[PDB]
Amino acid sequence: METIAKHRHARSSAQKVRLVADLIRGKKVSQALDILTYTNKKAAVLVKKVLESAIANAEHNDGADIDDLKVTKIFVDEGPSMKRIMPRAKGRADRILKRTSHITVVVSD
């Protein structure tokens, strides 16, 4: 049985989140939680929240036994970007992209 949790429109670019996502792909959930706890990235907090949500969803809506769950799939997709403005010198203006990401964690046994 596969259980999914997503964080859509997370405020972080997909590249930065993928750096953390590749740390836990294929790991047991307890090991993944430790890895995420001792990772000094902003994205580690977001991915840990999604992983905890997936574990809770599995346990509640599906069967149980947190102890044999693994991170079967994980991927980060790009979300919509927010277009902003950065003023530069000599009256010029630049586009700022505030990139977001969709985080998906699939947990299974």
């Binding site: 902003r84 403005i85 000599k90 009256g91 010029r92 203006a93």
Partner: protein, 33 residues
């Protein structure tokens, strides 16, 4: 108990883009005069 604001009177952010031509000095650039 707290409730939900559900207003965001600044939610819609209008975005634009405009620039300005820049003077450059070319006089020693020249292969001529």
């Amino acid at each position: 108990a707290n409730g939900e604001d559900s207003s965001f009177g600044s939610f819609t952010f209008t975005v634009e883009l405009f620039s300005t031509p820049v003077w450059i000095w070319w006089w020693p650039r020249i292969r001529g005069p």
